[PDB]
Design a protein around this nucleic acid. Structure first.
Ligand SMILES: [Mn+2]
Ligand SMILES: [Mn+2]
Lengths: 590, 243, 243, 251
DNA sequence: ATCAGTCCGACGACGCATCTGCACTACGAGG
DNA sequence: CCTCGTAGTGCAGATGCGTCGTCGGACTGAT
């Protein structure tokens, strides 16, 4: 009964990253410990308090609130930790130095009684559960209070991971899939039963209930498993390939292709008279989509089925799909019935894995791809994606011309054969989720002057791997920022950037450069670099062409990428605001 | 355990210093009075309320009473009465306490005792250097005024003045020196220089106004304390860690 | 056509109470009444409000039955601009609904006649076991303070009395409306049960300062029949589907 | 180094609010003939001028004409609270910055105000010398009513004046606003000379109006045929405000 | 020594919650 | 009716989440 383990034993799981001992150490977590606590420690290794299908609030402490909370914990001001973290960059390894002055009495410990102790797993989990649900008018000072108090009752090594736990993903080197082999090599010997553990984990998305079921029972408990309605099954995925022909020689006679759309792939459910609309990330989105529950229970003549499909937004005039950005409007919880009249929708169904109360996870793609054809009848609403059996090799590209008009670009390749079933759990070479040639951005070559830099975040964020670029304006003899560059530099270039900036480091901003963004340090404009981008976009952050096109906004270069330095070009020879505006004008309006 | 309270404003304002300070408290109806002292999770601030058997229409007790509550829920279930409506609090079983609001509609609610545990608080037994007395409405206005843009306020008074000053952008100060309207009372031991931050130290807003006589207890290297006195022997004492 | 009411804050308030349940509605004019009805897109709440022939100050009819269908947001938010005590006259000849105020400042608003409707007049003849009569000024004072302790209510009657009880989470609210208590006018005896949500009964409290009395026809496994008694012989029915 | 007391603190707050709605940094030009300030917008569409004739001040002693530039980034809010209509406010220069004081005879809660600024060269008092035909007086709930009414149904408001009549027509063809000001409506006095129409900036109309709440005295409003409108009203304890908005002659 | 599978993780734009603080107004009550 | 105190709403500003994937670079391990 102690949470000190997730500091002491968990300090070594980031310096020995080898996939030979981190799995061995992950075994020690479930080697010999408590009964119900293990089911609760499981959620550490997924960056969650609990699986997101049961229905629970999301922790509201993000970064700036966490900044204020840690300022309260260390009795410091807002700006000190702000700058100390901006310079370091990797937020979370700040608390070790923050709790370097271990002196905080305040009240409750200075008058009659002095005491100090630690916590345990069941305490932290309970506090997190309570802090998630608390909401209302008394919110800002109450959510911060618990994090601050636990931090004040934390330890220097604890305050290395307690910050990141609130931040999100554990920066360890271990994911959820490794927990699947952890118990496999801990309780039931080794990797021999790892396939069985994965098989049991596939159809039910939980991680506490499954773990408890396995713990209370034996290893053979991984056998009697069926998809029970409700708790969904983890969807499978694949990769993107550029090879035009690498599938026919491995599969049947060109088989069938059923396109590939976007739109927040979702698993429809149906039990008795209830239906659930679980999505990609295993979150309840049934309420936010009340227009699809009437599409399934009233037009899919089934009894109890769990299927897979995608819910793409539909244009209000005709059916030509829409970007998922426009689909994002359907995340409202209050004015739900109003947005329905503006943005129509149409779902498509690809997979069909459960009916007649009998499992269908491991079956050929003939009773799965085309199973309930007399059930999902054609209507003015949800259909099945158009598929046509490809005859010969040359037919792998003929339907591209017709299917590109929809806007989904790439298609998938259904692979027949007993070796090719819908066994989920691992994203790999199962059935080709190609993208043809997809759609890339544009290319434009310009030369820009380095005027500032930003320290990056993460394990490699110590160096100044991010820069702010500015353009010379002959009319005003001033430099205005046009874009912020953080990627495109090789290892040697990144290493030399710090020394180059230090050789010209200045405390105060140069009078001839102006920008609304505040860099970590100010750099004299000396060197000129070439940056390639996609398109010019309006951004209020940058002062380039201010108020020329849009008021209180400026032009910015989308997708910055470094190419090469320009040692023979002076800053005055850099791209000008007039040239930027002229290039922007030539771009298509649509 | 039947109790009747004539007023609701006392039960609509005292918890404002309790609603957002510590989310859990132990409403402790004693065998002879009602006294409330509860710690806080921040380990910074702490409020206390003293109330004897002078404002209760009926008060019958036999054993200790520990009706738990949620601060937000307690405020919610005490927002119905507006003008003068009385209250009727009693039950028979220690699982739910029937909270009946007297007047208008015969209305009683059932609320679970969300029991919580907390440590005890000693009876201060600490002396301070200054126990001043100003206009409570004026002093509350000063706490709301000097800290409107800043995020830290410094308290400094040398001999005959009190300045809760907040600096960093503009050194704007409010003084109550001699009998010019402020400083209705003053005890002295040394010159004063301290700070008290903004935000939830500004969130003691709608508590002072019950009695228009504030009384600070600020002192060097000592926690804060606001001293009060209401009718019927009701005094509320504040606590606050330095800066 | 020419329309006018004696209370610019009343008719606009009855229509503003339709701005939380109905996301759309249509207007038609009968020989001696104006119909505010239509089935909500929520497919649960049924709304049909009848304006009496006596609410106006010179209502006229030109040719025959005319549809004056509107858009919710405009005729709701432009008519949010009401003074403390004004008069609201409505003029709409063929295409433009001109919401015109008069009194302290003769002002007007303009809006084209938008044509969109959902005219489903379902039959309402199912009988109910229970009957009660409560004034418009107590039902709201109860439900609004009951509108925050969850989202689902329950109604049960025994020995000829109406018990408003709110359940959910861990704490319950009880209300004991009764003729003897005086919080009633007339009622009847029938022991039945049902259950209803809050958003379907809390969004309709806004029509408080527009009515004189209130008729509630509670029932068992049948739609809830809340009738808002109108000044000068009007109909204020608010049908609610069961749980 | 001067010492001038304004017996009404809320009047000073109203003046600084009225001048704030045009910019972020303001001035207080101290001359031997009074206390006055001047500003204008970047697009030359609206501006506020505040002046204090040297007859209403409790005391008024200045050696040389002095002007100082100050910002109300913090001064606005630190002066946003003054809970005494009977509070006197006084301003006195310091060695380096600006120092203002407010006195209330209710709680002795004297508040000290410090502003980091220094004196600068003054500018000669110059007001646009124009004559406006239509002239009338009104309350503080007629201009605000027009502003709030128009703030929704459009941004182009036209104030039309007929023979002893006033007509409002604004917005676009889809949504308009109809109202009249018959002799002795929400006005009080009228000095109309010629029936003329004009237009201004409805959003900036409300922006100009919203810095006027607290004027217990009637407001005198005048304009002309495409003439920049005058919105004139003085507070209880002295101080005359003159508001300029420029007519946007088509867009 | 050389490429296959395999795997954790970092990435930075968009639209909507959700709360916090302020600004203005409506009403109830003692004089 | 005058005045004040408090409830009540309307509205900007600040933090956070969900969302498509996209590409990376290192590890095992059999020829
Ligand atoms: Mn996070
Ligand atoms: Mn999430």
């Amino acid at each position: 009964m102690e949470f000190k383990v997730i500091a002491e034993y968990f300090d070594k799981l980031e310096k020995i990253s080898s996939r030979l001992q981190l799995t061995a150490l992950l075994a020690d977590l479930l080697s010999k410990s408590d009964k119900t606590i293990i089911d609760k420690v499981v959620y550490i290794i997924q960056g969650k308090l609990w699986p997101d299908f049961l229905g629970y609030p999301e922790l509201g402490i993000g970064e700036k609130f966490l900044i204020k909370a840690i300022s309260i914990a260390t009795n410091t001001d807002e700006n000190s930790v702000e700058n100390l973290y901006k310079t370091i960059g990797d937020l979370g390894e700040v608390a070790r130095r923050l709790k370097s002055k271990q002196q905080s009495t305040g009240i409750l410990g200075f008058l009659g009684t002095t005491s100090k102790e630690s916590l345990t797993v069941d305490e932290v989990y309970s506090t997190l559960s309570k802090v998630a649900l608390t909401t209302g008018e008394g919110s800002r000072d109450l959510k911060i209070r618990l994090l601050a108090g636990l931090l004040k009752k934390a330890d220097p090594l604890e305050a290395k991971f307690l910050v990141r736990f609130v931040e999100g993903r554990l920066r360890v080197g271990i994911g959820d899939a490794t927990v699947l082999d952890a118990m496999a090599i801990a309780f039931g010997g080794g990797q021999s039963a790892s396939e069985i553990i994965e098989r049991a984990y596939n159809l039910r998305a939980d991680l506490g209930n499954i773990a408890k079921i396995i713990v209370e029972k034996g290893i053979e408990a991984l056998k009697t498993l069926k998809p029970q309605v409700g708790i969904p099954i983890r969807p499978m995925l694949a990769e993107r390939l550029s090879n035009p022909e690498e599938i026919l020689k491995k599969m049947g006679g060109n088989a069938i292709v059923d396109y590939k759309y976007d739109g927040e792939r979702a698993q429809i459910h149906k039990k008795e008279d209830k239906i659930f609309i679980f999505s990609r990330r295993l979150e309840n989105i049934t309420s936010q989509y009340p227009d699809v529950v009437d599409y399934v229970s009233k037009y899919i003549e089934g009894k109890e089925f769990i299927i897979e499909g995608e819910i793409v937004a539909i244009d209000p005039e005709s059916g030509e799909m829409r970007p998922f950005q426009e689909l994002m409007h359907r995340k409202r919880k209050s004015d739900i019935y109003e947005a329905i009249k503006e943005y129509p929708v149409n779902v498509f169904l690809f997979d069909l894995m459960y009916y007649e109360d009998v499992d269908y996870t491991t079956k050929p793609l003939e009773a799965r791809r085309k199973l309930l054809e007399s059930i999902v009848k054609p209507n003015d609403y949800v259909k099945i994606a158009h598929h046509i059996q490809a005859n010969n090799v040359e037919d792998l590209k003929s339907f591209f011309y017709r299917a590109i008009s929809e806007g989904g670009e790439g298609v998938m390749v259904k692979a027949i054969g007993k070796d090719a079933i819908y066994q989920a759990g691992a994203r790999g070479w199962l059935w080709i989720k190609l993208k043809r040639d997809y759609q890339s951005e544009m290319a434009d070559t310009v030369d820009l002057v380095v005027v500032g830099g930003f320290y990056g975040k993460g394990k490699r964020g110590g160096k100044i791997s991010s820069l702010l670029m500015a353009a010379y304006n002959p009319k005003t003899d001033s430099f205005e920022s046009v874009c912020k560059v953080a990627s495109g530099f090789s290892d040697e270039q990144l290493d030399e950037l710090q020394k180059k900036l230090m050789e010209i480091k200045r405390d105060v901003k140069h009078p001839r450069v102006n920008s609304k963004m505040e860099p970590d340090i100010w750099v004299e404009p000396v060197y000129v670099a070439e940056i390639i981008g996609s398109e010019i976009t309006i951004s209020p952050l940058h002062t380039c062409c201010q108020d020329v096109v849009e008021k209180d906004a400026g032009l910015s270069i989308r997708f910055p990428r470094f190419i090469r330095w320009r040692d023979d070009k002076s800053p005055e020879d850099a791209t000008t605001t007039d040239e930027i505006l002229e290039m922007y004008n030539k771009q298509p309006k649509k | 355990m039947k109790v009747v309270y004539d007023d609701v404003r006392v039960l609509k304002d005292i918890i404002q210093a309790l609603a957002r300070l510590v989310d859990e408290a132990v409403l402790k109806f004693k065998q002879d009075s009602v006294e409330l002292v509860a710690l806080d999770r921040a380990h910074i601030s702490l409020i206390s309320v003293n109330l004897p058997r002078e404002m209760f229409k009926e008060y019958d007790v036999n054993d200790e009473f520990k009706f738990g509550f949620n601060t937000q829920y307690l405020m919610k279930i005490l927002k119905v009465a507006k003008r003068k409506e009385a209250i009727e609090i009693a039950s028979e079983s220690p699982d739910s306490v029937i909270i009946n609001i007297i007047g208008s509609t015969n209305r009683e609610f059932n609320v679970r005792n969300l029991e919580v545990s907390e440590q005890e608080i000693p009876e201060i037994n600490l002396q301070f250097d200054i126990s001043a007395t100003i206009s409570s409405d004026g002093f509350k206005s000063a706490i709301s005024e000097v800290s409107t843009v800043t995020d830290n306020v410094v308290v400094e008074g040398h001999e005959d003045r009190i300045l809760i000053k907040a600096e960093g952008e503009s050194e704007v100060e409010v003084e109550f020196s001699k009998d010019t309207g402020g400083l209705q009372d003053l005890e002295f031991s040394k010159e004063s220089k301290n700070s008290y931050s903004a935000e939830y130290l500004d969130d003691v807003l709608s508590l002072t106004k019950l009695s228009d006589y504030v009384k600070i207890s600020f002192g060097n290297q000592k926690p804060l304390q606001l001293f009060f006195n209401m009718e019927g022997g009701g005094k509320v004492t504040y606590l606050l860690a330095p800066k | 056509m020419k329309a006018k009411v004696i209370d610019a804050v009343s008719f606009s308030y009855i229509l503003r109470t339709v701005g939380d349940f109905l996301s759309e509605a249509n207007f038609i004019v009968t020989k001696e009444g104006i119909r505010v009805s239509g089935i909500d897109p929520s497919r649960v709440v049924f709304l049909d409000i009848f304006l009496p022939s006596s609410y106006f100050e010179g209502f006229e009819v030109s040719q025959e039955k005319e549809i004056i269908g509107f858009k919710l947001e405009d005729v709701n938010d432009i008519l949010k601009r009401v003074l403390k005590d004004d008069t609201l006259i409505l003029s709409s000849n063929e295409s433009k609904l001109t919401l015109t105020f008069d009194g302290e400042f003769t002002r007007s608003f303009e809006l084209p006649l938008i044509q969109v409707e959902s005219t489903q007049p379902p039959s309402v003849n199912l009988e109910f076991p229970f009957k009660a009569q409560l004034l418009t000024i107590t039902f709201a004072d109860i439900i609004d303070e009951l509108s925050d302790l969850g989202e689902v209510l329950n109604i049960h009657s025994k020995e000829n009395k109406l018990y408003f009880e709110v359940i959910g989470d861990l704490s319950t609210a009880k209300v004991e409306l009764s003729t003897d208590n005086g919080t009633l006018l007339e009622a009847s005896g029938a022991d039945v049960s049902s259950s209803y949500g809050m958003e379907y009964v809390a969004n309709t409290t806004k029509m408080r300062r527009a009515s004189d009395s209130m008729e509630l026809y509670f029932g068992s496994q049948i739609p809830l029949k809340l009738r808002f008694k109108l000044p000068q012989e009007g109909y204020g029915d608010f049908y609610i589907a069961p749980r | 180094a001067f010492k001038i007391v304004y017996p009404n603190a809320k009047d000073f707050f109203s003046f600084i609010n009225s001048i704030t709605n045009v910019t972020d940094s303001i001035i207080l030009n101290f001359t031997e003939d009074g206390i006055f300030s001047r500003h204008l917008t970047e697009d030359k569409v609206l501006m506020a001028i505040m002046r204090i004739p040297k007859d209403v001040l409790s005391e008024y002693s200045i050696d040389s004409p002095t002007s100082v530039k100050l910002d109300v980034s913090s001064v606005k809010k630190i002066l946003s609270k003054a809970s005494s209509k009977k509070a006197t406010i006084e301003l006195t220069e310091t060695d380096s910055g600006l120092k203002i004081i407010i006195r209330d005879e209710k709680s002795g809660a004297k508040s000290t105000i410090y502003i980091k600024a220094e004196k600068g060269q003054v500018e000669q008092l110059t007001e646009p010398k124009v004559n406006l035909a239509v002239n009338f007086t009104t309350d503080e709930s007629v201009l605000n009513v027009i502003a709030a009414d128009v703030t929704l149904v459009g941004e182009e408001m036209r104030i039309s004046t007929e023979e002893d009549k006033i007509k409002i027509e604004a917005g676009e063809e889809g949504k308009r606003y109809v109202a009249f000001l018959m002799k002795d409506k929400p006005l009080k006095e009228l000095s109309i000379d010629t029936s003329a129409s004009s237009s201004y900036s409805a959003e900036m109309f409300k922006d100009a109006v919203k810095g006027l709440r607290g004027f217990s005295a009637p407001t005198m409003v005048s304009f002309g045929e495409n003439l920049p409108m005058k919105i004139d009203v003085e507070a209880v304890s002295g101080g005359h405000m003159i508001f300029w908005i420029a007519p946007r002659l088509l867009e």
